[PDB]
Amino acid sequence: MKVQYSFEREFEELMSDLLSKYGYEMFQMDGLGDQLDVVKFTEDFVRTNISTYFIEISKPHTYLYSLYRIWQKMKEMFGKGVADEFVEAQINGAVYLHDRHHAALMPYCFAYTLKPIVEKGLPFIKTIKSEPAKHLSTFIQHVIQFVMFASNQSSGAVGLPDFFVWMWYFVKKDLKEGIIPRDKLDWYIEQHFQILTYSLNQPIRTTQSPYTNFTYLDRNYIKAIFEGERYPDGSLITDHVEDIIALQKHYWEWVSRERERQMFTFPVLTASLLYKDGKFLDEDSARFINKINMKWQDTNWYISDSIDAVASCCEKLKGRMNSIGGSDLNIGSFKVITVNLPRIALESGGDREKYLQILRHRVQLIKKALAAVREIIKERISEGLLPLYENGLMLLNRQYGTIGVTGVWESASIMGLTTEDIDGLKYTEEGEVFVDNVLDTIREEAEKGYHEYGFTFNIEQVPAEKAAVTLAQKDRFLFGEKQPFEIYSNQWVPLMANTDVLNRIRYSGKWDKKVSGGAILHINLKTEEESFNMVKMIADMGVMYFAFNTKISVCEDGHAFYGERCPVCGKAKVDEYMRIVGYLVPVSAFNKER
Amino acid sequence: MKVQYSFEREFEELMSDLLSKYGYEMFQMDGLGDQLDVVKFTEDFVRRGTNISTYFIEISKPHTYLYSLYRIWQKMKEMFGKGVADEFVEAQINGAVYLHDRHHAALMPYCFAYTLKPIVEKGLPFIKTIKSEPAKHLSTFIQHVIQFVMFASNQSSGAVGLPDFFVWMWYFVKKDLKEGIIPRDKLDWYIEQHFQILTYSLNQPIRTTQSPYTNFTYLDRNYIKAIFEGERYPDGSLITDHVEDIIALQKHYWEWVSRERERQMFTFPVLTASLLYKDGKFLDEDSARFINKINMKWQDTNWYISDSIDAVASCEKLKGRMNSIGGSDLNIGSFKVITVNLPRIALESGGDREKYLQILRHRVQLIKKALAAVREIIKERISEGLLPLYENGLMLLNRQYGTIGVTGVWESASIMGLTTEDIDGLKYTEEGEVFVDNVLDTIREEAEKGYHEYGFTFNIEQVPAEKAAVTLAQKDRFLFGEKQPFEIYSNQWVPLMANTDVLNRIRYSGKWDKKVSGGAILHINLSFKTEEESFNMVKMIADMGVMYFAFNTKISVCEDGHAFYGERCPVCGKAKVDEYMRIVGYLVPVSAFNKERREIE
Ligand SMILES: Nc1ncnc2c1ncn2[C@H]1C[C@H](O)[C@@H](COP(=O)(O)OP(=O)(O)OP(=O)(O)O)O1
Ligand SMILES: Nc1ncnc2c1ncn2[C@H]1C[C@H](O)[C@@H](COP(=O)(O)OP(=O)(O)OP(=O)(O)O)O1
Ligand SMILES: Nc1ccn([C@@H]2O[C@H](COP(=O)(O)OP(=O)(O)OP(=O)(O)O)[C@@H](O)[C@H]2O)c(=O)n1
Ligand SMILES: Nc1ccn([C@@H]2O[C@H](COP(=O)(O)OP(=O)(O)OP(=O)(O)O)[C@@H](O)[C@H]2O)c(=O)n1
Ligand SMILES: [Mg+2]
Ligand SMILES: [Mg+2]
Ligand SMILES: [Zn+2]
Ligand SMILES: [Zn+2]
């Protein structure tokens, strides 16, 4: 049976024109082939439970609408030619539209402050309304309901950096009023840690749990952010730095302790530390994080050289944006659109000058697309469909349009700008300059964007959990043996590359700053003092976001351990946890997705 | 653009035939017209002002219905041949029958009333994102109940029943109190605070588009004793040793609910009190008088009346009350409801009552085959691993009815010319009452045969039909026009808004509730003069044989959701802006019902 989609002839012609050129396998690769056939899709899915079915079924169709809607908007704003060009690039694999099934419907991610939740409660829930919390139990509960609300109003992370700032207030209150058995205060704190953590690891996005971030704010950051800001009882938040610190430390100690019982992913843990002139200003917090990380290495290191971007937080945008974790308070991105660099290399045929003209062009096309998507978001807001915006929780003016990049290594390899020696794989000198030029080119267009389109752009070397595959596929499909790589890399140097770590650190030191920390370095791995030194060295080199990776075994009951046998129940290892794309995940789910 | 779906050409030919015989308008009414066009659907949704999270659930419903329709057609063809398969598809699309939750029909089952026993004894091993050990505290127990409701409510189409909630909650209240986890001087707070955490969670949009549908049951002493006979708590103690404890906690919730509404109104959980009643008296009179008293305020509780506990003792033909609104016995559910359009048969019969009854038996027998097919599809999904509720022994297939729904009884008889009026208002004629006796008995016979026929037990229910009551009258009015003067069909033996003496309503429910085995409801719009007067009236109704009933008040609410009576909020002083009313058996915002009803006119 045939089903009609009321597309403009111009679109249907375009789609037709592309289908004839690229063929069906390309549309199949883009998820617009057999996946649009409900009967085929369903009996295919028949091979996670049924609640997943209803989320997965509509994605090809909502993608196809969003593609169409963005095409329409881009044509309105920049003419048919530009609109057609984006669609072709999206389908052929020149660019990767992220969360494309959502792209013309809701935004991507934002790091929230819980302040307005503490102060207004939950008025934006329409099925029922909640007053502001008066107890630790309710406060925790409000966060849970908020993450449920927010994680289905957006595609990406829900960041909760200042969570522990507000939690302490309700610890003090319930302690004041004698709700806690003081003979068991640590159990009480750790119970609310447990209840929150386990809830955030429930399939609240149906197909999976929400993506959430916690931040250990160091003493310097707590001071800068909440300078002058008061608690609901009128007291000053800054007066309780040490109180807020110990609560944070408590959680990190507890989670390290909890993993043996049950291994979990979320929240993603980052420690934000200020570091100047070869030293941590909050050295106490620094040595603490380094110590807790010794067990699982489950906290990412965020390093910054100033706190100016976060002063008195609570038109050009400043503040670190990172998809994995570490994003500053009240910073996000409404959408990412990535540039396939290996594609540009294959197109350039070696001509670095043509590459940089092709690159500069595609970045500008992306900027136009981001500007179109942003217009759609604003439509959806006015249409009453995005209450996160209307209740002042998600802030559009505080969301970047993000220009993504991936496959940096593979691109330079295709250009023939990599090599190997006693220290392993590396870039040639021309290669490093080429990277400087690529990143400099994109930086130029990002800055021009602000004056061009009225909002701030940023740049990120994205995790590319899926794009790293479907792009190498589309390029393989369109260039064959010329594209030898099975997947593209999400770091300056590939994770599984035989190379001295000192080179990895240097490249990150060179280029992390160019993307404003919009990247991550993590190395697969023996003393505490030895470990802490390594951290300082990496920080000296200028690396802005990094972590160390361990192989965490698990059994079918969820016990965390190292080895082949569980030291809890004796059940053998069955799966592994590892930081593959920035956060700790089961390898089995990762490989099966790929 | 054009999109292909891989149907057997036999099905495609069938759909082709039906379209030519009924026209595109028929498919539009069935939700298989413009609704399947994503661009049309989206731009339509985009200017329907609920937020963007709703879009992704509503978008696929026409498509998933189409698949489910196609899958049932296939299975029905495999079990009973193409004629029966074609006969069913035609009957669904034209409106002879109503497939409930049709967008889920080939994917997941309908409803069930669970016991939290396995949750208590095993925790949450079936959640895949993370695993929880058996609870050890009140806080975790509550939090487990919540994860269970989220789990179950998105793997079924209908109600998540929690009859024995207060039985199990109490044990953890006692555990945390003993071990100094709960401060004694704040014993009542910790209890009402977790009443509040659970209840508010249950009114969160956990099903995205809406909150879950949940039920609570006040089990009276007789029911507690019967159900948990010989059953022990985790500490080893007998549950029947703590009947009084369980009762008191239950009373605390009802007292609390009635206390909590003025602060914030809410629908869920839907409240029912199950009471044993024989020979003109309540066997647990203390519980009955309590419920009678508490209800004086909001009338927010439904009365469930039974005359024996034989059907729930120590909890292959299935017995146990199944009711969609609430009151469903522990470990009872339905895997699917398919309703028969009775006014349709009236229109076909032309008045010939013998002809009517022939058509009815046929369509019931057609419905039974459909239920049997769906049940086979469910079993397929289970084995395919898509329905863990079964694998973990929470949802029980053997304990699930196949349901032959009914609707439009009044309107049907009216068309037959078997209704009238007198000094005490609208009522059935003598032959009309006989006719209704024949209709229900006929269906009942076939249901009973179904067990021997199809291997599982069948039940009957005059369903709420919040939507079906509209779309069927629409289709009938489209196919018969002037012959069908009703805008909607009724979900009670006598229409709620029909001027009739209440005693007539009670009589008819007394007569016919037992035929559907309490598979119905009776609610009367109201003030009483005394508590004792109300209690007498409850006993009168219970004498008459009514099995499920309630009284209705018009609960005002302001913009912040405070519950009150009148035009001014006693809490904030803000004016009334909306009402709450039991329209189909549970309390809802009238503005929500009216518009949801309007979005299908
Ligand atoms: N699970 C939940 N989800 C959302 N809101 C909730 C939940 N539980 C409680 N609430 C709401 C109810 C209240 O409007 C609000 C604050 O409740 P709470 O902090 O317990 O104060 P309260 O109004 O209950 O007074 P108290 O509990 O001190 O008697 O939170
Ligand atoms: N919000 C939640 N959702 C799901 N599971 C949870 C939640 N909070 C805690 N759990 C899990 C964690 C445990 O595996 C299990 C039992 O927790 P609980 O009853 O608090 O005892 P416990 O194992 O934490 O011992 P204790 O609390 O006495 O240290 O429930
Ligand atoms: N289970 C996940 C994984 C990732 N993310 C979000 O997506 C980001 C990384 O996405 P990426 O892997 O780059 O996206 P792809 O999978 O390549 O593409 P798509 O947009 O289709 O997911 C994370 O930082 C996070 O904010 C998420 O919400 N949930
Ligand atoms: N918001 C609601 C309303 C009802 N129900 C379930 O559906 C039953 C009543 O459904 P009914 O009104 O008979 O179905 P319709 O809405 O007419 O048809 P459909 O199956 O298409 O919903 C209730 O008892 C309840 O178990 C539900 O899960 N959620
Ligand atoms: Mg605990
Ligand atoms: Mg409270
Ligand atoms: Zn184990
Ligand atoms: Zn009010």
Residue numbers in the entry:
A (entry chain A): 1 to 47, 64 to 330, 350 to 560, 565 to 633
B (entry chain B): 1 to 49, 64 to 329, 350 to 560, 563 to 637
Could you pull the original sentences from the published paper?
Here we present the crystal structure of a second class III RNR from Thermotoga maritima (tmNrdD), which, as purified and crystallized, surprisingly does not display such a cysteine, possessing an isoleucine (Ile) in its place. Nevertheless tmNrdD binds a substrate and its allosteric effector in productive conformations as expected from previous structures of RNRs of all three classes, and it is enzymatically active.
The structure of tmNrdD has also been determined in complex with the allosteric substrate specificity effector dATP and its cognate substrate CTP, as well as with dATP alone. Effector binding induces a conformation of the substrate-proximal side of loop 2 that projects the side chains of Arg221 and Gln224 towards the substrate base, thereby enhancing CTP binding through three H-bonds between these side chains and its base. As in the other classes, the α and β phosphate groups of the substrate are held in place by several H-bonding interactions to the N-terminus of a conserved α-helix (499–514). The γ-phosphate group interacts with the side chain hydroxyl group of Tyr112, His114 and the main chain amide group of Asp115. With the ribose positioned as described, Ile359 at the tip of the finger loop is positioned in between the radical-bearing residue Gly621 and the substrate; however it does not reveal an obvious pathway for transfer of the radical (see Discussion). Furthermore the crystal structure of the dATP/CTP complex shows that the SIGG motif is compatible with substrate binding.
